Amino acid sequence: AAQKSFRIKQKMAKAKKQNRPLPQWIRLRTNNTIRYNAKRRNWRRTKMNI
Amino acid sequence: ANLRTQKRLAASVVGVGKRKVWLDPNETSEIAQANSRNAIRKLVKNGTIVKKAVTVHSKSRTRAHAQSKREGRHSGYGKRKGTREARLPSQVVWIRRLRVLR
Amino acid sequence: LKDVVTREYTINLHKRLHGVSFKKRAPRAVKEIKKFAKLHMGTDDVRLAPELNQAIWKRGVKGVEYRLRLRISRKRNEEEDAKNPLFSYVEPVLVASAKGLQTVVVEED
């Protein structure tokens, strides 16, 4: 890294856009039971294995 | 308040390292209002943030020590820790002599 | 009831910092001047002046002078006032010889 492919950088883009909590409106929804974001990754605790 | 960013930008603008920038505590809130390099360049000119010029390292006892070695001091057997070849080699004394004759 | 009387002193730090480790002879000189001002003036909030902090740390951690000419003031407190109504405030006084001086009451005139 710092000098990369495009495939790996594309996967950094997708793992960036996934790295956000629930939107607040999903909690108030009818018959919603998604309490939080469970597939959340952080760069310290879970390396993404590309 | 918090003045990390302003010290970073001040050292980056004035050119001197972070260990030499001055952020006086009287004007502190005004320095906390300046959040750009262009505002730092206005807080530099009027005298709010100055250089803190260099700690002096006077090579003067070096000059006295050198001048005293010039007169023929500091050259006994105990001010001398490398060998007679390590200080001034045999080869260089010879190359000085034999070019002179040549 | 006023008790605002400023007094100067010599504190003999040599018989206070005796036997203290060398990386603790200046900060314990600080923690000893706060106790000294508690013992004389009586109050429990003490403010050392930063010029006194320079006067302790001239010769590093372990080169505290033997005797420091202090000027201890006692003042009243304000601004959402603390647990004491009064405090002390210890400034240095800048003398040639801290040896040979007694204690002297400073007049405010």
Partner: protein
């Protein structure tokens, strides 16, 4: 020596992302995947590894074409369009 300081030297990769199964199981030196087996003509699948088939048989992805087969069988593979009667 063979435990943690030798783990300190572990800065490379044997494997990179396979183009067919997207997995980081394509060996760099061997130039072959190890989970699917690209670039062979097949996908590696074994009856000893019954879980690996279950992880990658049909019905786990999108079914971008099979989803519309039974339904399209269900009419008898008609071509054209329907007519309009009323309302």
């Amino acid at each position: 020596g063979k435990g943690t300081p030798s783990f300190g030297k572990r800065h490379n990769k044997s494997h990179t992302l396979c183009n067919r199964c997207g997995r980081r199981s394509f060996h760099v030196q061997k130039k072959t995947c190890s989970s699917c087996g690209y670039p062979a003509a097949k996908t590696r699948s074994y009856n000893w590894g019954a879980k690996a088939k279950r992880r990658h048989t049909t019905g786990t992805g999108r079914m971008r074409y099979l989803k519309h087969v039974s339904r399209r069988f269900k009419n008898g593979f008609q071509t054209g369009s329907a007519s309009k009667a009323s309302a």
